[PDB]
Structure 1
Amino acid sequence: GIPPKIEALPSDISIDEGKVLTVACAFTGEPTPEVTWSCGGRKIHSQEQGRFHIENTDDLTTLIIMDVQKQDGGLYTLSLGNEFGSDSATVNIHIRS
């Protein structure tokens, strides 16, 4: 029994519009926690807008935003959960125009 734990997530990251942004985050937990990326209470699904992609391995999750738009700026929350507990962290993503 090991509750999930997010290793580290930056509080803030900046990116120029028209670029690709990737944010990778390590985690632990036994069993492997389920991974949720969300925007204001709503789970983000891989391929949304043909630009957002999420890839999860056993100890690393990656959020990919291709061709970054001004509307993409905002708070993105990573949440982890298993039978032993949950962990959650938020990154504020700022777009430079």
Structure 2
Amino acid sequence: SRGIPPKIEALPSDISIDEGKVLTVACAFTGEPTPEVTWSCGGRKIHSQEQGRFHIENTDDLTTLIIMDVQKQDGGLYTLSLGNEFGSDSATVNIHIRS
């Protein structure tokens, strides 16, 4: 049984969403043991909450980030980071909000 460092698969470099609408971004990964997923923006962890507009759903090889009723303040560079006992990986997507 071999450990596998985390590896993020393809992630869009830039995405757009109109203000007020819902945005979903899904990204696959590999890693053994299953990596811990962290989404961040402005160097700060995004916390998934039942109430609130930000939701994160993580499985063994997928993360989905949902931002509901998107606001101008949500725009910016988002980082997806993965960690496990054998390494780390990160990628970014730049989210553009249209008025």
Q: Same fold (TM over 0.5)?
A: yes
| Correspondence for 1:69 | 71
Following TM superposition, the consecutive aligned residue runs of length 4 or more in structure 1 with deviations greater than 6 angstroms are none
Find the residue that maps to 2:96 and give its secondary structure. strand
Identity %: 100
Find the residue that maps to 1:8 and give its secondary structure. coil
Structure 1 unaligned segments of length 5 or more: list them. Answer: none
Count of paired positions = 97
Structure 2 unaligned segments of length 5 or more: list them. Answer: none
Find the residue that maps to 1:71 and give its secondary structure. helix
Which deviations, in whole Å up to 9, do the C-alpha atoms of 1:53-92 show, x marking residues without a partner?
0010111000100001111101110000111110000100
TM norm structure 2: 0.94
Offset at residue 49 of structure 1 (A):
7.5
Which deviations, in whole Å up to 9, do the C-alpha atoms of 1:20-74 show, x marking residues without a partner?
0000000000100000000122111002881000010111000100001111101
Shift in CA distance, 49/11, structure 1 to aligned 2, threshold 3 Å: farther
* RMSD (CA atoms): 1.3
Shift in CA distance, 49/42, structure 1 to aligned 2, threshold 3 Å: farther
TM norm structure 1: 0.95
| More deviation, 43-52/17-26 | 43-52
